[PDB]
Design a protein around this ligand. Structure first.
Ligand SMILES: COC1=C2C[C@@H](C)C[C@H](OC)[C@H](O)[C@@H](C)/C=C(\C)[C@H](OC(N)=O)[C@@H](OC)/C=C\C=C(/C)C(=O)NC(=CC1=O)C2=O
Length: 215
């Protein structure tokens, strides 16, 4: 018998609103979700990279600085793994939903006024939530040098959970799994995703591997 403690958290009110907005509104061009996944991976990779300049020991958990992108049609998932800095449990609790952040209300206001469109979400520091343009459920596995591996999960609806992660160890970094909406499964088509990764990684300084799963 396996045993696991799972903690449930409620999204901050504005974050809940933003998630409903991203989910319950039709947006015709959703490819920003991929730009954001890759940009966030790159940011996390930058952070560990710069940390390694002043402290070489930070890389001992995983030497490679790389991104892996894994479309899996059978599983209806898109997975993006980085070997960046990773996030502690508290990092994920604080930054993946409980704490109100500086750009949330401003983004929502600009969405409604037309000052911003959905593709500009990243500028407001809430680009993670763009995953809900294409996914019903998002799972974030993360491993920071200062903590054990944890797994965050949400299907929106106002709550997330976080638990000690007993799945494949990352060494260091973050593995985000998007459980794709039935209407957005075309994002798992091999050629489509390969080419979109090319399109949205033009300024990325880290190796990317595209691993297409066949079952
Ligand atoms: C400048 O940093 C960014 C912030 C500030 C803050 C959260 C940074 C975070 O603090 C713990 C780490 O320093 C950073 C390395 C981790 C990531 C980028 C994670 O990505 C991966 N692959 O690790 C991302 O994972 C889903 C987590 C939150 C992202 C959010 C909520 C977002 O919507 N936009 C943001 C994008 C950013 O670039 C954002 O708010």
């Amino acid at each position: 018998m396996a045993e696991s403690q799972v903690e449930r958290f409620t999204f901050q009110a504005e974050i809940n609103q933003l998630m409903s907005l991203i989910i319950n509104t039709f947006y015709s061009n959703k490819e920003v979700f991929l730009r954001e996944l890759i940009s966030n991976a790159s940011d996390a990779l930058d952070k560990i990279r710069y940390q390694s300049l002043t402290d070489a020991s930070v890389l001992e958990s995983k030497t490679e600085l790389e991104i892996k992108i894994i479309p899996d049609k059978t599983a209806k998932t898109l997975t993006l793994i980085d070997s960046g800095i990773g996030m502690t449990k508290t990092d994920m609790v604080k930054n993946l939903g409980t704490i109100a952040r500086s750009g949330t209300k401003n983004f929502m206001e600009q969405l409604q006024s037309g000052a911003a469109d959905i593709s500009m979400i990243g500028q407001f520091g809430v680009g993670f939530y763009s995953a809900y343009l294409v996914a019903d459920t998002v799972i974030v596995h993360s491993k920071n040098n200062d903590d054990e591996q944890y797994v965050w999960e949400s299907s929106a609806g106002g709550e997330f959970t976080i638990a000690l992660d007993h799945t494949e160890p990352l060494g260091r970094g973050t593995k985000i799994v998007l459980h794709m909406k039935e209407d957005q499964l075309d994002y798992l088509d091999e050629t489509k995703i390969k080419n979109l990764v090319k399109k949205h990684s033009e300024f990325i300084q880290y190796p990317i591997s595209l691993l297409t799963i066949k079952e």
